[PDB]
Amino acid sequence: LAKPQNTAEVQKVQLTGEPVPMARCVSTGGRPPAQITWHSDLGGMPNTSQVPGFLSGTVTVTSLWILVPSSQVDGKNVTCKVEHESFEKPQLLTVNLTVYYPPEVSISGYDNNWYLGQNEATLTCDARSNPEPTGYNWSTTMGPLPPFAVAQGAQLLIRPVDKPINTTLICNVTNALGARQAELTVQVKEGP
Numbered sequence: 001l002a003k004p005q006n007t008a009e010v011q012k013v014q015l016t017g018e019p020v021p022m023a024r025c026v027s028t029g030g031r032p033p034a035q036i037t038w039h040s041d042l043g044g045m046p047n048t049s050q051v052p053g054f055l056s057g058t059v060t061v062t063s064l065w066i067l068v069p070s071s072q073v074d075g076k077n078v079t080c081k082v083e084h085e086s087f088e089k090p091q092l093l094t095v096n097l098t099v100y101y102p103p104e105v106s107i108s109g110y111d112n113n114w115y116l117g118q119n120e121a122t123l124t125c126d127a128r129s130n131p132e133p134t135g136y137n138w139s140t141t142m143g144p145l146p147p148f149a150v151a152q153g154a155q156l157l158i159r160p161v162d163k164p165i166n167t168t169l170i171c172n173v174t175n176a177l178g179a180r181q182a183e184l185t186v187q188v189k190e191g192p
């Protein structure tokens with residue numbers, strides 16, 4: 001028998017409809033051939049294959065992990081387990097998935113309890129994409145931003161109001177692949 005060594009890269013992927021290979025794992029020069037299995041919180045479909053090795057009697061196994069690409073998987077871990085009767089213990093190889101996609105946006109920092117004459121409250125335009133977003137843009141459903149709302153990069157500062165107002169905000173985010181956007185209505189009364 002022969003002790004074979006192995007590798008594993010990460011096959012970068014876009015947002016195609018079909019299930020494509022997102023991670024490869026390979027054990028070259030096995031005798032006998034090695035056993036390759038995958039383990040992770042988000043299992044899919046592993047497709048294995050093998051070609052003759054270098055020294056007569058050996059075999060190199062090449063297994064790829066196929067899955068239907070999706071935004072929440074970017075950054076997640078996938079582990080390949082190469083087990084063979086010649087190692088001290090089953091060897092473990094881990095890859096760091098990668099998926100490019102348009103920006104998914106949302107706005108936080110608003111508790112329906114906004115009243116007249118309060119202190120400066122600021123909202124953040126939460127956005128998760130790959131690769132990182134290149135530009136942020138604030139505007140209103142009416143066109144230009146009201147005078148009490150001054151834009152600050154990826155955040156919008158809301159100053160004190162003298163009289164009640166209404167305005168649905170829009171955060172247009174642009175990264176290297178596209179440009180998306182969120183919506184959001186905000187109110188300020190008097191009450192107590």
Ligand SMILES: *[C@@H]1O[C@H](CO[C@@H]2O[C@@H](C)[C@@H](O)[C@@H](O)[C@@H]2O)[C@@H](O[C@@H]2O[C@H](CO)[C@@H](O[C@@H]3O[C@H](CO)[C@@H](O)[C@H](O)[C@@H]3O)[C@H](O)[C@H]2NC(C)=O)[C@H](O)[C@H]1NC(C)=O
Nearest residue numbers: 116161162163164165166167168184185186187188189190
């Ligand atoms: C901010 O807007 C509110 C109302 O907000 C409401 O929802 C928004 C998304 C828009 O669709 C608005 O058009 C809509 O009003 C203003 O106060 C609202 O005024 C309207 C009419 O002036 C009130 O209509 C009432 O409807 C109820 C039943 O739904 C009837 O019982 C009443 O008789 C009356 O017809 C509406 O009730 C009232 N909304 C609230 C929550 O009180 C508000 O004036 C505006 N801000 C400022 C500073 O003017």
Ligand SMILES: *[C@@H]1O[C@H](CO)[C@@H](O[C@@H]2O[C@H](CO)[C@@H](O[C@@H]3O[C@H](CO)[C@@H](O)[C@H](O)[C@@H]3O)[C@H](O)[C@H]2NC(C)=O)[C@H](O)[C@H]1NC(C)=O
Nearest residue numbers: 010073074075076077078094095096097098099130131132
């Ligand atoms: C897979 O690898 C990627 C990058 O190779 C990892 O992304 C990295 O995520 C960490 C934490 O989530 C980021 O580190 C933090 O950076 C900020 C700087 O903004 C710093 O303030 C923090 O103290 C911390 O160091 C890191 O920026 C980010 N890498 C890149 C290139 O953006 C990802 O976590 C890996 N995924 C898994 C499942 O291991």
Ligand SMILES: *[C@@H]1O[C@H](CO)[C@@H](O[C@@H]2O[C@H](CO)[C@@H](O)[C@H](O)[C@H]2NC(C)=O)[C@H](O)[C@H]1NC(C)=O
Nearest residue numbers: 020021045046047048049050062063064065066
């Ligand atoms: C694993 O993938 C291989 C190819 O990587 C599949 O082989 C294909 O087989 C289909 C029919 O089943 C053929 O139409 C293709 O030409 C083959 N593709 C290649 C690249 O050879 C194989 O079917 C897959 N294994 C399993 C068990 O599904």
Ligand SMILES: *[C@@H]1O[C@H](CO)[C@@H](O[C@@H]2O[C@H](CO)[C@@H](O)[C@H](O)[C@H]2NC(C)=O)[C@H](O)[C@H]1NC(C)=O
Nearest residue numbers: 039040041075076077078079093094095096097
């Ligand atoms: C995801 O994979 C990374 C490696 O890319 C893991 O990082 C290891 O963390 C352990 C314990 O924290 C360390 O002993 C190792 O040194 C780290 N690996 C490297 C190469 O530095 C991480 O544990 C994994 N996390 C998840 C959630 O899967």
Ligand SMILES: *[C@@H]1O[C@H](CO)[C@@H](O)[C@H](O)[C@H]1NC(C)=O
Nearest residue numbers: 137139172173174179180181
């Ligand atoms: C968002 O910003 C991009 C970049 O300039 C622009 O082309 C696009 O028209 C904007 N989208 C909307 C809905 O305003």
